[PDB]
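On clarity, I found the account of how folds are encoded harder to follow than it need be. For illustration, here is how one protein appears when written out as sequence plus C-alpha coordinates.
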Amino acid sequence: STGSATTTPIDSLDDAYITPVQIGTPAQTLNLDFDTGSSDLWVFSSETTASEVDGQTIYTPSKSTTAKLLSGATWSISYGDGSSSSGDVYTDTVSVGGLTVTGQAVESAKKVSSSFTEDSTIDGLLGLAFSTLNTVSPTQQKTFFDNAKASLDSPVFTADLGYHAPGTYNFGFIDTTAYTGSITYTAVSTKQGFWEWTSTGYAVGSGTFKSTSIDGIADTGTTLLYLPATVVSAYWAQVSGAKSSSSVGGYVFPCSATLPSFTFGVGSARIVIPGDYIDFGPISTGSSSCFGGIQSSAGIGINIFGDVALKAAFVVFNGATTPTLGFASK
Protein backbone atom coordinates (compact mmCIF):
# COMPACT_ATOMS: atom_id res chain seq x y z
CA SER A 1 0.00 0.00 0.00
CA THR A 2 0.87 3.68 -0.23
CA GLY A 3 -0.50 7.02 0.90
CA SER A 4 -0.08 10.58 -0.36
CA ALA A 5 -1.36 13.73 1.38
CA THR A 6 -0.87 17.42 0.79
CA THR A 7 0.59 19.45 3.65
CA THR A 8 -0.22 23.18 3.85
CA PRO A 9 1.47 26.03 5.76
CA ILE A 10 -0.69 27.36 8.62
CA ASP A 11 0.25 30.98 7.96
CA SER A 12 2.25 33.31 5.71
CA LEU A 13 5.52 32.53 7.54
CA ASP A 14 5.39 28.73 7.26
CA ASP A 15 5.34 28.51 11.07
CA ALA A 16 4.04 24.94 10.76
CA TYR A 17 2.30 22.68 8.26
CA ILE A 18 -1.02 20.86 8.57
CA THR A 19 -2.07 17.66 6.85
CA PRO A 20 -5.63 16.30 6.82
CA VAL A 21 -6.10 12.98 8.63
CA GLN A 22 -9.23 10.81 8.71
CA ILE A 23 -10.03 9.34 12.14
CA GLY A 24 -12.87 6.98 13.00
CA THR A 25 -16.02 5.70 11.31
CA PRO A 26 -17.60 7.66 9.75
CA ALA A 27 -14.42 9.66 9.14
CA GLN A 28 -13.71 12.72 11.23
CA THR A 29 -11.12 14.81 9.39
CA LEU A 30 -8.66 16.71 11.58
CA ASN A 31 -5.71 18.81 10.40
CA LEU A 32 -2.62 17.51 12.15
CA ASP A 33 0.96 18.73 12.47
CA PHE A 34 3.16 15.88 11.22
CA ASP A 35 6.16 15.87 13.56
CA THR A 36 9.27 13.77 12.85
CA GLY A 37 10.61 14.94 16.24
CA SER A 38 7.97 13.22 18.40
CA SER A 39 6.05 9.96 18.54
CA ASP A 40 2.52 10.63 19.82
CA LEU A 41 -0.60 11.02 17.67
CA TRP A 42 -2.78 13.28 19.81
CA VAL A 43 -5.88 15.29 19.04
CA PHE A 44 -8.15 17.95 20.37
CA SER A 45 -11.29 16.08 21.38
CA SER A 46 -14.68 16.10 23.03
CA GLU A 47 -12.70 15.45 26.24
CA THR A 48 -10.53 18.58 25.99
CA THR A 49 -11.15 21.15 28.74
CA ALA A 50 -13.65 23.52 27.10
CA SER A 51 -11.76 26.72 27.97
CA GLU A 52 -8.69 25.31 26.19
CA VAL A 53 -10.47 24.82 22.86
CA ASP A 54 -10.60 27.90 20.61
CA GLY A 55 -11.55 27.10 17.01
CA GLN A 56 -9.97 23.65 16.60
CA THR A 57 -11.82 20.73 15.08
CA ILE A 58 -12.29 18.02 17.69
CA TYR A 59 -12.35 14.23 17.58
CA THR A 60 -15.44 12.79 19.28
CA PRO A 61 -14.81 9.10 19.94
CA SER A 62 -18.43 8.45 20.99
CA LYS A 63 -19.44 9.23 17.38
CA SER A 64 -17.01 6.68 15.90
CA THR A 65 -18.26 3.10 15.64
CA THR A 66 -14.66 1.84 15.52
CA ALA A 67 -13.34 3.76 18.55
CA LYS A 68 -12.42 1.78 21.65
CA LEU A 69 -11.10 3.13 24.94
CA LEU A 70 -7.62 1.78 25.63
CA SER A 71 -8.40 1.02 29.23
CA GLY A 72 -6.07 2.50 31.82
CA ALA A 73 -3.81 4.22 29.30
CA THR A 74 -2.75 7.83 29.76
CA TRP A 75 -0.27 10.11 28.04
CA SER A 76 1.57 13.35 28.79
CA ILE A 77 4.08 15.13 26.59
CA SER A 78 6.24 18.23 26.78
CA TYR A 79 7.82 19.71 23.68
CA GLY A 80 11.07 21.60 23.16
CA ASP A 81 9.22 24.90 22.84
CA GLY A 82 7.74 24.53 26.33
CA SER A 83 4.27 23.50 25.19
CA SER A 84 2.49 20.40 26.50
CA SER A 85 -0.63 18.26 26.44
CA SER A 86 -2.02 15.17 28.16
CA GLY A 87 -5.02 12.87 28.31
CA ASP A 88 -6.28 9.34 27.74
CA VAL A 89 -6.23 6.99 24.75
CA TYR A 90 -8.54 5.35 22.21
CA THR A 91 -7.75 2.98 19.40
CA ASP A 92 -9.44 3.76 16.10
CA THR A 93 -9.00 3.63 12.33
CA VAL A 94 -6.71 6.34 10.99
CA SER A 95 -6.12 7.14 7.33
CA VAL A 96 -3.61 9.49 5.73
CA GLY A 97 -3.81 10.18 2.03
CA GLY A 98 -5.52 6.86 1.32
CA LEU A 99 -3.32 4.74 3.61
CA THR A 100 -5.31 3.15 6.43
CA VAL A 101 -4.18 1.80 9.80
CA THR A 102 -6.64 -0.03 12.02
CA GLY A 103 -6.12 -0.06 15.78
CA GLN A 104 -4.01 3.10 15.83
CA ALA A 105 -3.56 4.73 19.24
CA VAL A 106 -5.32 8.08 19.10
CA GLU A 107 -4.37 10.08 22.17
CA SER A 108 -7.28 12.27 23.27
CA ALA A 109 -6.29 15.52 24.97
CA LYS A 110 -7.91 16.39 28.26
CA LYS A 111 -5.52 19.34 28.70
CA VAL A 112 -3.41 21.39 26.30
CA SER A 113 -1.10 24.31 27.00
CA SER A 114 -1.84 27.85 25.90
CA SER A 115 0.24 27.72 22.70
CA PHE A 116 -1.98 24.94 21.39
CA THR A 117 -5.22 26.66 22.39
CA GLU A 118 -4.08 29.86 20.72
CA ASP A 119 -3.39 28.13 17.41
CA SER A 120 -6.81 27.46 15.90
CA THR A 121 -5.33 25.86 12.76
CA ILE A 122 -3.68 22.82 14.42
CA ASP A 123 -6.07 20.09 15.61
CA GLY A 124 -3.28 17.88 17.02
CA LEU A 125 0.03 16.23 16.19
CA LEU A 126 0.98 13.08 14.32
CA GLY A 127 4.36 11.87 15.52
CA LEU A 128 6.80 10.29 13.07
CA ALA A 129 9.91 9.82 15.22
CA PHE A 130 10.69 6.37 16.65
CA SER A 131 8.08 4.64 18.79
CA THR A 132 10.52 4.42 21.70
CA LEU A 133 9.62 8.08 22.42
CA ASN A 134 5.87 7.45 22.63
CA THR A 135 4.55 8.65 26.00
CA VAL A 136 1.57 6.31 26.53
CA SER A 137 1.65 4.57 29.90
CA PRO A 138 1.64 1.82 31.07
CA THR A 139 1.75 0.28 27.57
CA GLN A 140 3.79 2.28 25.05
CA GLN A 141 2.11 2.65 21.66
CA LYS A 142 3.36 2.66 18.07
CA THR A 143 3.37 5.55 15.63
CA PHE A 144 1.20 5.61 12.54
CA PHE A 145 4.28 4.89 10.41
CA ASP A 146 5.40 1.98 12.59
CA ASN A 147 1.91 0.46 12.36
CA ALA A 148 1.70 0.98 8.59
CA LYS A 149 5.23 -0.11 7.76
CA ALA A 150 4.74 -3.80 7.08
CA SER A 151 1.89 -3.06 4.65
CA LEU A 152 3.78 -0.39 2.74
CA ASP A 153 5.28 -1.11 -0.69
CA SER A 154 8.60 0.19 0.73
CA PRO A 155 9.21 1.02 4.43
CA VAL A 156 9.65 4.75 3.88
CA PHE A 157 7.94 8.09 4.08
CA THR A 158 8.99 11.34 2.43
CA ALA A 159 8.62 14.98 3.39
CA ASP A 160 8.42 17.56 0.60
CA LEU A 161 7.62 20.82 2.38
CA GLY A 162 6.90 23.97 0.39
CA TYR A 163 8.22 27.48 0.83
CA HIS A 164 5.12 29.65 1.24
CA ALA A 165 3.24 26.90 -0.65
CA PRO A 166 1.71 23.45 -0.13
CA GLY A 167 3.83 20.31 -0.27
CA THR A 168 3.44 16.57 0.20
CA TYR A 169 3.90 13.70 2.64
CA ASN A 170 4.11 10.32 0.88
CA PHE A 171 4.08 6.91 2.57
CA GLY A 172 5.46 3.75 1.02
CA PHE A 173 7.06 5.10 -2.17
CA ILE A 174 9.58 7.61 -3.45
CA ASP A 175 8.16 9.97 -6.09
CA THR A 176 11.05 10.20 -8.55
CA THR A 177 9.40 13.23 -10.22
CA ALA A 178 9.51 15.29 -7.00
CA TYR A 179 13.24 16.06 -6.88
CA THR A 180 16.17 16.92 -9.10
CA GLY A 181 19.43 15.02 -9.43
CA SER A 182 20.04 12.12 -7.04
CA ILE A 183 19.11 11.39 -3.42
CA THR A 184 22.09 11.23 -1.06
CA TYR A 185 21.58 8.87 1.85
CA THR A 186 23.24 9.28 5.23
CA ALA A 187 23.38 7.24 8.44
CA VAL A 188 20.89 7.62 11.27
CA SER A 189 21.28 7.02 14.98
CA THR A 190 18.05 6.03 16.72
CA LYS A 191 19.67 6.09 20.18
CA GLN A 192 17.72 9.18 21.28
CA GLY A 193 14.55 8.17 19.40
CA PHE A 194 15.02 10.81 16.70
CA TRP A 195 15.97 10.85 13.03
CA GLU A 196 19.46 11.88 14.10
CA TRP A 197 22.21 12.29 11.52
CA THR A 198 25.50 14.12 10.93
CA SER A 199 25.81 16.91 8.40
CA THR A 200 29.23 17.24 6.78
CA GLY A 201 29.46 21.04 7.01
CA TYR A 202 28.15 24.36 5.83
CA ALA A 203 28.64 27.47 3.74
CA VAL A 204 27.28 31.01 4.05
CA GLY A 205 26.19 32.65 0.83
CA SER A 206 28.83 32.28 -1.89
CA GLY A 207 31.48 31.54 0.73
CA THR A 208 33.73 28.52 0.92
CA PHE A 209 32.37 25.29 2.38
CA LYS A 210 33.52 24.48 5.91
CA SER A 211 33.92 20.74 6.44
CA THR A 212 32.77 19.99 9.97
CA SER A 213 30.53 17.34 11.52
CA ILE A 214 27.21 18.68 12.81
CA ASP A 215 25.04 16.11 14.58
CA GLY A 216 21.36 17.00 14.57
CA ILE A 217 17.79 15.82 14.04
CA ALA A 218 15.51 16.06 11.03
CA ASP A 219 12.43 17.59 12.67
CA THR A 220 9.40 18.61 10.63
CA GLY A 221 7.69 19.84 13.81
CA THR A 222 10.27 22.57 14.48
CA THR A 223 9.97 25.77 12.44
CA LEU A 224 13.57 27.01 12.40
CA LEU A 225 17.11 25.77 11.85
CA TYR A 226 19.01 25.51 15.17
CA LEU A 227 22.79 25.08 14.86
CA PRO A 228 25.91 25.60 16.99
CA ALA A 229 26.60 29.18 18.05
CA THR A 230 29.80 29.29 16.00
CA VAL A 231 27.93 28.44 12.78
CA VAL A 232 25.06 30.82 13.51
CA SER A 233 27.42 33.71 14.33
CA ALA A 234 29.25 33.12 11.03
CA TYR A 235 25.94 33.33 9.15
CA TRP A 236 24.61 36.51 10.79
CA ALA A 237 27.98 38.27 10.54
CA GLN A 238 27.25 38.47 6.80
CA VAL A 239 24.08 40.54 7.40
CA SER A 240 24.66 44.21 8.15
CA GLY A 241 23.00 45.21 11.40
CA ALA A 242 22.09 41.67 12.50
CA LYS A 243 22.49 40.95 16.20
CA SER A 244 21.45 38.54 18.88
CA SER A 245 18.76 40.07 21.05
CA SER A 246 18.23 38.55 24.49
CA SER A 247 14.99 40.55 24.79
CA VAL A 248 13.54 39.14 21.56
CA GLY A 249 14.99 35.66 22.05
CA GLY A 250 17.48 35.27 19.22
CA TYR A 251 19.02 36.80 16.16
CA VAL A 252 17.20 39.69 14.53
CA PHE A 253 18.13 41.64 11.44
CA PRO A 254 17.02 44.81 9.63
CA CYS A 255 13.94 44.08 7.54
CA SER A 256 15.64 46.05 4.74
CA ALA A 257 18.35 43.36 4.40
CA THR A 258 18.86 40.89 1.60
CA LEU A 259 19.73 37.61 3.35
CA PRO A 260 22.47 35.29 2.07
CA SER A 261 21.75 31.64 1.40
CA PHE A 262 22.91 28.89 3.74
CA THR A 263 24.27 25.57 2.49
CA PHE A 264 24.44 22.36 4.52
CA GLY A 265 26.28 19.16 3.62
CA VAL A 266 24.79 15.70 3.26
CA GLY A 267 27.75 13.46 2.60
CA SER A 268 29.44 14.93 -0.48
CA ALA A 269 26.15 16.57 -1.54
CA ARG A 270 24.97 20.07 -0.72
CA ILE A 271 21.50 21.48 0.05
CA VAL A 272 21.09 25.22 -0.48
CA ILE A 273 18.61 27.16 1.65
CA PRO A 274 17.76 30.41 -0.19
CA GLY A 275 18.08 33.57 1.87
CA ASP A 276 14.37 34.30 1.67
CA TYR A 277 13.65 31.05 3.55
CA ILE A 278 15.53 32.53 6.53
CA ASP A 279 13.22 35.57 6.84
CA PHE A 280 10.56 35.22 9.56
CA GLY A 281 9.35 38.78 9.28
CA PRO A 282 8.82 41.63 11.73
CA ILE A 283 9.30 40.74 15.39
CA SER A 284 6.01 42.55 16.10
CA THR A 285 3.50 44.09 13.72
CA GLY A 286 4.97 47.14 11.98
CA SER A 287 8.50 46.65 13.31
CA SER A 288 11.53 47.12 11.05
CA SER A 289 13.38 44.44 13.05
CA CYS A 290 12.91 41.00 11.52
CA PHE A 291 13.36 37.59 13.12
CA GLY A 292 15.96 35.20 11.76
CA GLY A 293 15.30 31.66 10.64
CA ILE A 294 18.71 30.34 11.71
CA GLN A 295 19.19 30.40 15.49
CA SER A 296 21.61 29.02 18.04
CA SER A 297 21.02 25.57 19.51
CA ALA A 298 23.11 26.44 22.57
CA GLY A 299 21.11 25.41 25.60
CA ILE A 300 18.70 23.23 23.58
CA GLY A 301 21.17 20.39 23.87
CA ILE A 302 20.71 19.27 20.26
CA ASN A 303 20.96 20.75 16.77
CA ILE A 304 17.67 20.79 14.89
CA PHE A 305 17.22 20.68 11.13
CA GLY A 306 13.70 22.09 11.24
CA ASP A 307 11.42 23.28 8.47
CA VAL A 308 13.77 26.07 7.28
CA ALA A 309 16.26 23.39 6.27
CA LEU A 310 13.93 20.56 5.32
CA LYS A 311 11.76 22.62 2.98
CA ALA A 312 14.85 23.23 0.80
CA ALA A 313 15.00 19.47 0.12
CA PHE A 314 13.10 16.35 -0.77
CA VAL A 315 13.66 14.22 2.35
CA VAL A 316 13.42 10.43 2.61
CA PHE A 317 12.81 8.91 6.03
CA ASN A 318 13.90 5.33 5.40
CA GLY A 319 12.50 3.02 8.08
CA ALA A 320 14.23 -0.12 6.90
CA THR A 321 15.77 -2.41 9.54
CA THR A 322 18.73 -0.04 9.61
CA PRO A 323 17.14 3.39 9.16
CA THR A 324 18.72 6.09 7.01
CA LEU A 325 17.87 9.59 5.78
CA GLY A 326 17.97 10.75 2.17
CA PHE A 327 18.19 14.32 0.87
CA ALA A 328 17.77 15.61 -2.67
CA SER A 329 17.56 19.09 -4.13
CA LYS A 330 14.25 20.00 -5.78
Q: What stands out?
A: Residues 229-236 form the longest helix (8 residues). The domain at 5-174 is CATH 2.40.70.10 (Cathepsin D, subunit A; domain 1).
